[PDB]
Structures are given as C-alpha cells and as structure tokens.
Amino acid sequence: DIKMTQSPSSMYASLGERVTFTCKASQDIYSSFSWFQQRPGKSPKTLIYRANRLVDGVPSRFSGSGSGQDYSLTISSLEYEDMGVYFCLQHEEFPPTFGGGTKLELKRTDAAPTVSIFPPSSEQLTSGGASVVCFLNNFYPKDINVKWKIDGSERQNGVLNSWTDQDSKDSTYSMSSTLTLTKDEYERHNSYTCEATHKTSTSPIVKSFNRN
C-alpha cells in the first residue's frame, strides 16, 4: 500500500495562532486526499476532500493545499475546539491508507500539582489487598515524576501511573499513581510517602501518612 508520512506527530499551540500539518505520500496521489479531525472521545470527522475543498459546515479557518506527493492542512486562527488528532488519507489506490495522525494540544503557563494521598480503604483490606493512591492534579506541562517511600526506603515495584488527556476546561493534566501491596506487606511498615517532582520547583511536593 501507499505510505503516508504525517508530521509533526504532536504539537502545542496557543490560541489565535496559525498552525500547519504536512503529509507526504510515497507516490503521486493526484489530489485524492482528505483530512480528518478526531476530537477527544469521538469518531473522526471529514474536514477536507480533494486536497483543497472544505466539507460543508467546516469553518473557513481550515484550508488544505498541495499536489503530487506533498500536502498541507493549515488552521489560520486556532480556536479551543480545534484540539484533537488530525489524520490524512490517500484514496488514489485501494486500499486507502491513513497517515499516523498529528495530536494538537493547547499551550499554557506552567502550574505545580496539587497532591493528595489515600491509604487503603477498609473494604480493600478485608479482601487481602492494599492499594495506596496518590493523585497529582492540575499541573502543566505533562512530564512529572512520582516517588514512593515506605518507612523511608524508595519503592518502585508495583507502581501504576495513569495520566489524563489535557483538561478541556483549563488545559492542565492530572495523574494517578497507585502502589499495590499485599495486605501482609502493607502491615509490615508504618509510614507511606508520595513525592512529586515537577519542573515548577526544585523541591518535591511530599504527602505522607502513618498507619498509626
């Protein structure tokens, strides 16, 4: 099949800014080319067809150009609803092939996380397990490190870290870190600590509790 190479793979952009995605085909596709938008949590929507024609209802700030092997999508004045993943498609030859997608996200000012720690619930301890949970809320940018300490010693085995996508209201990220132990192991120690390191400060944010 014809290969479609889309760039960049992701980018951050400010509101009102001009943004351009490119796509390169492995052979001439004679403008049998379309762009699609996939907003978070939804199915794709066709934006453009024939390289440069706008689908009805799509605002005029979108525009496509190109020919031969090289095609471009330009968003002239970025708006909040333009975030999501953009895909190119050639349909000159069967099977049609999609590009790998460009993820468009919102650039904003740096923000430190708000950190909360949760001991295992009494219901979980009845079952024989014990999860300690750390929530890191409302930070930017996305990169962040979490360190768990049990009675002062670092523990990395059994940690599960999950980030949200970019917040639709304030463009921050959040992440959940879950340390899963056996009940027997949880009861062998007393103090549990979640330490978050983020570029907004050289000192980590620390939350702890003691089993008492």
């Binding site: 099949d1 049998s32 379309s34 199915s43 794709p44 929507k45 066709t46 067809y49 024939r50 689908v55 993943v85 895909f87 498609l89 349909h91 069967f94 099977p95 049609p96 092939t97 999609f98 790998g100 997608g101 708000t114 909360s116 720690i117 949760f118 001991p119 295992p120 619930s121 009494s122 219901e123 979980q124 079952s127 397990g129 999860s131 949970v133 929530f135 809320n137 599960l160 999950s162 980030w163 949200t164 996508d165 917040d167 959040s174 992440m175 959940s176 879950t178 899963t180 509790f209 008492n212």
Partner: protein, 220 residues
C-alpha cells in the same frame, strides 16, 4: 440527518467469530457504496473492507481465506461485517463509513463498535472508596474512587449520578497483570463534605455490575 449506528462488538476468544451490524438512516442506503474502517488501540486507522451496490463487488485489505466478509441487506438498510478466525491483533474500534460517490472518498462516519479479542474471562470490578487521611484541613477536599480488577473494557464512572461534574478527573484504565484498573478524583469545597453525600457510580456492562459507592470519613 444521516445516521450510522454500529453494534455487535464485544469480547471474543481467538479463533472465534463475530458479526457486526451498521444500521443506516436518513439517506437512500441502496445507492451509496460503504466501507468498514478500524482504529487499533494504538489509535492507528486502517481500511478493512469495501462494498459497492452489488453483493459480489467486495474488496478487502487482507483477503486471507474467510477472515473478513462484508455484506449488505438493502431491504433492512443495514451493513454487515463478519469477522472469522479472530486474532488478538483484530482488537479495535470498527467504524462504518459512507462513500460520497463513485470514488473512495468518505463523508459520514458511524459511532464505532468495540471489538476485543482476548483469552481472558469477563471479570467484575471491585469498587473501593478513597476518603482523605484520618485528620481534617483546607479550603477544599479531594475524594477518590478506585475501580480494580475488571475485564474487558470499558467501565463508566460518574459522581452523584452525573450531577457532580466540575472538579472531576478520571484516569484512563490501565492493564495490570491481565486486569484493568481505573480511578477517579473529585475536589469540592470543605464545607460541603461530609455534610452532603458524595457517591461514586460505577457500571461494567460486560459483567452487568453496577455499584454506587458512598464516600464516608475514615474512623477512628
């Protein structure tokens, strides 16, 4: 008002079979060519199958004998995709798409139907409330819900039956030793909890599990 609505997806063991349907409405179904397209868990989009007005003029991306069969019933305004000899890598969201004219250009997409090919058994989640640490001080309070040990995806989770949506963050499910774990946090002002009840609502349709878990302060 063009509408394409897929169904038929679910969990299936490798080697099994699954028939997907696409109910169309709002246009003269019998005059448009149709395709199926799938999106993998890595979010890659890929063509599957294509059919014209005729029942024999079908085209497949992979034509390995008897693995994909696209068909259509013009009297029922329905499109079908028969999946056979399923492989793990057939796991994806399958989309019904309508061709605009005689070419391969697409206009409308369906909502998708999720297919999971796995050897694992369906498993109900355990739902655990996350209350703050014994103590209690600040302008707001953060509560949590931990949903652990289920299969397959998805679970849905709301707070107070949807009426509490501000300050909510739900963290995507992650596979941990064959089973999924998900969590959610909600932040509200300190004067509203625990004076007002806050409840985690968790639904896992594949196991029919529905749990409404009240968050209550820790004791002592």
């Amino acid at each position: 008002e063009v509408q394409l609505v897929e169904s038929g997806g679910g969990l299936m063991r490798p080697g099994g079979s699954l028939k997907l349907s696409c109910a169309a409405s709002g246009f003269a179904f019998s005059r448009f060519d149709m395709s199926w397209v799938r999106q993998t868990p890595e979010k890659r989009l890929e063509w599957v199958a294509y059919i014209r007005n005729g029942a024999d003029d079908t085209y497949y991306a992979d034509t390995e004998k008897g693995r994909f069969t696209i068909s259509r019933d013009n009297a029922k305004n329905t499109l079908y995709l028969q999946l056979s000899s399923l492989k793990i890598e057939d796991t994806a969201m399958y989309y019904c798409v309508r061709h605009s004219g005689y070419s391969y250009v697409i206009d409308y997409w369906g909502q998708g139907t999720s297919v999971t090919v796995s050897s694992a058994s369906t498993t109900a989640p355990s739902v655990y409330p996350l209350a703050p640490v014994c103590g209690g001080t600040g302008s707001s309070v953060t509560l949590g819900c931990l949903v652990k040990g289920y299969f397959p995806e998805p679970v849905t989770l709301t707070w107070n039956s949807g009426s509490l949506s501000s300050g909510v963050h739900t963290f995507p499910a992650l596979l941990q030793s064959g089973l999924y774990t998900l969590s959610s946090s909600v932040t509200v002002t300190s004067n509203t909890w625990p004076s007002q009840t806050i409840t985690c609502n968790v639904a896992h349709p594949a196991s029919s599990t529905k749990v409404d878990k009240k968050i209550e302060p820790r004791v002592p």
